[PDB]
Amino acid sequence: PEEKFKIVRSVGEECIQEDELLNLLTKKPEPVCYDGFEPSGRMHIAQGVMKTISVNKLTSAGCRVKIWIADWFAKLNNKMGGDLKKIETVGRYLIEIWKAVGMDVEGGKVEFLWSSKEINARADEYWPLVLDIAQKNNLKRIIRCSQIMGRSEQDELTAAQIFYPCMQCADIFFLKADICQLGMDQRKVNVLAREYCDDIKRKNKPIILSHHMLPGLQQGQEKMSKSDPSSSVFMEDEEAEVNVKIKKAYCPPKVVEGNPCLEYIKYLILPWFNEFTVERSADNGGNKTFKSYEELIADYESGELHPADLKPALSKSLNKILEPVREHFRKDSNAKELLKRVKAYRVTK
Amino acid sequence: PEEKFKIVRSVGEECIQEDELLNLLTKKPEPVCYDGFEPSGRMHIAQGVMKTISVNKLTSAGCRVKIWIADWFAKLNNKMGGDLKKIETVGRYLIEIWKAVGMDVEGGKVEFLWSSKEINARADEYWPLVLDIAQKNNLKRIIRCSQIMGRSEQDELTAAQIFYPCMQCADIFFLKADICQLGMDQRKVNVLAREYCDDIKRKNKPIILSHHMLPGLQQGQEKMSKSDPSSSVFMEDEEAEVNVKIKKAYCPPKVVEGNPCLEYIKYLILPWFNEFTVERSADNGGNKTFKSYEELIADYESGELHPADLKPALSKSLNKILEPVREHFRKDSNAKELLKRVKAYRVTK
RNA sequence: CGUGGUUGACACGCAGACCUCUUACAAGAGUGUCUAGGUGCCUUUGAGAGUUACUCUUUGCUCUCUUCGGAAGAACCCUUAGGGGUUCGUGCAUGGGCUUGCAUAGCAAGUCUUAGAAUGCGGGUACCGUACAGUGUUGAAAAACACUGUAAAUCUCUAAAAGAGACCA
């Protein structure tokens, strides 16, 4: 079990109640992890590669991971104009990308679930729980959780934008979840779920594994936004476009803080290949391999590793990791049609 | 149609867009009526008998009436502690109550429908509507739709309590109703729904048929309260119970305003019996029969009809109205069991 | 913006931008490309009636003549030629004196300029260069002529928002 809490804790930067997670790993042989995915259009890299890495870490630890294709969450946030069929197409696109990028679906440990079909099948189990969470939480607590949706508390929130935390908190218990492996922004609704467990006196509270929020490619972008395609790497971005964005990616010399390129390295590459090789001419210090992020940041700050070397090796490696998905969507006809339809849709706020 | 227009109009104290109502009666041979009521315990007279009078008078106009069994909604309001089983038992109690009191169901024009059952059978049709109502209306408007559960906007609100108004407003297009026969009390959510569709630019708003809110037997009670059985005559109340409640009922001499006995006559006896007979000794002016309410008020204000004579006649007529219910619940085993269980349930605020 | 070409084509002095390559946004290379807007007016404007649980208001969708003349320009019907019957096209806030809150002059307000087209702004209305899709011609490439359109391609093809009068979990 020791390696296991290491393997899983490596999934998220923030882990609440580490001892209880250890207990769960020790006692219940196949913990169930989940994350929610609103199909809101083209999905950027932090969504694909980092999550594939995380789910692979979990399944290698023996965890069952449920990928919640949260369609009504997408409509509740008026994605795609709230269109059922476009949203279904986008979800199929996402599943295809995950299969292509190297997600261990064939392992039999990853199950992709639709909120509409699944919840439609057990409405009686769910809706009472939503009513209960909604009843046991005043409005203000629900509104504070709006950041799960990407909306501030000052946003004019539709009453559905008020219910949304209720359903998303409920899914935690609907799905009988053990580990909430999600992003930072899901932290408020996850705490809503624990305080609900406190209200309903369920001893077994869910473990919380909140993941690092991958920044946008431009300076000061705490997170990639689908609204700025140049600031977000899309998993279907082409070789040249990878290159262009990266070149345009912010990467000040000797400055690690707020330097996105180093962060994407840290959270994608070293997790992907265990090391980062910067290929350099003999005159400029020759080829160099970074097996760890500390070595990379040291060589970056000292000035031995300049951004002009990081970014090219960086985009090289990014295009490498992305090439299999390019090949899949070039080869698979249904995936190709899904890609064309998804790019044919307008991104909505 | 003018006959139909008058008949339907007489049901409610306030009838709105009378032009639209006349148009509907002329163009739709069988317009759709309904009532939504939380099964929250013992049935008092204003809720049973007045509703029976209105629904029967409407069905004689050829109208179809859908009685909305508000079990899921009642659970939203925590009736019987929100226990759906007790809610269902109370609903069966109330249905057999209407049957005993003289509903025209055998005419095939009255329909009892279950909110939980129908919503589950057509949840795909329902839930989107509630969402939409949530969207097009801010929080403040839905809280302004608070009353249809009862409290003012100031009392503490949970999120389920915010589902409720939009859920009723969705009931509208869920039921395909053209005229909504309910009390004055459904009003601000009524325009919640008109605003809803003005926004969708549909073409035909349904009519309201607002029933008078019957006061309690005590001074200053603008409406009946089940929290006060002493101010509430229950349709299963024995002759002694009715007589005592009427005796303690507020009825100042020569004062018509706020005299619940007079409104009780107006809305139960004259509508039910077409007349009101006050039995008095030859010395006390002898028996007098009131066919119209104005004659009753003229004699009452002039002092010829004293409360000592009005109250016994009121109690006699009310007991006459309630005797069929007593006989039904005395003879029918299932009705008697339902009565036992409903009386056994603590009316939960 | 100018140049030689009288002129269309053809090249040059400056900017910008679309695409590629590099490159840390920056920055640098490539002529593959393009780059004037006008001629014309209207458009601040009675009321009511309707937009799937009340009224009304701030706004939006439909029915009667569509307020200083209101269908501006267009289109449909009929003509000796002058004309006529019909439809569509319905923009939004302020002033300026009038007096005050202010010793008169910000901002607003009680009044009018049906609208001082005055101050700010879009849409439709023919023509033109431009560019392309389509026709016919001159045309060996290129270029050009005339018509439809676009230049702000296109629209809630109906998921129009808010506000004031009430009985809860």
Question: How would you describe this structure to a colleague?
Answer:
Two copies of one chain form a homodimer. Chain A is of the alpha/beta class. The first copy, chain A, folds into two domains: 2-211, HUPs (Rossmann fold), CATH 3.40.50; 229-343, Tyrosyl-Transfer RNA Synthetase (Orthogonal Bundle), CATH 1.10.240. Chain A has helices at residues 2-9, 18-27, 45-60, 71-76, 84-101, 115-121, 123-136, 139-144, 159-174, 187-199, 239-248, 260-273, 293-302, 307-331, 333-343; strands spanning 14-16, 32-37, 64-69, 110-114, 179-183, 207-211, 276-278, 288-290. In chain A, the strands form two sheets. The first copy, chain A, has a six-stranded mixed sheet. In chain A, helix 3 packs parallel to helix 12 and helix 14 packs across helix 15 (333-343). The longest helix of chain A has 25 residues, at 307-331. Chain A is globular and about 70 Å long. The first copy, chain A, starts with a helix and ends in a 6-residue tail after the last helix. Chains A and B meet through helix 7 and helix 9 of A and helix 7 and helix 9 of B. Chain B binds one RNA strand of 169 nucleotides through strand 1, helix 2, helix 4, helix 7 and helix 9.
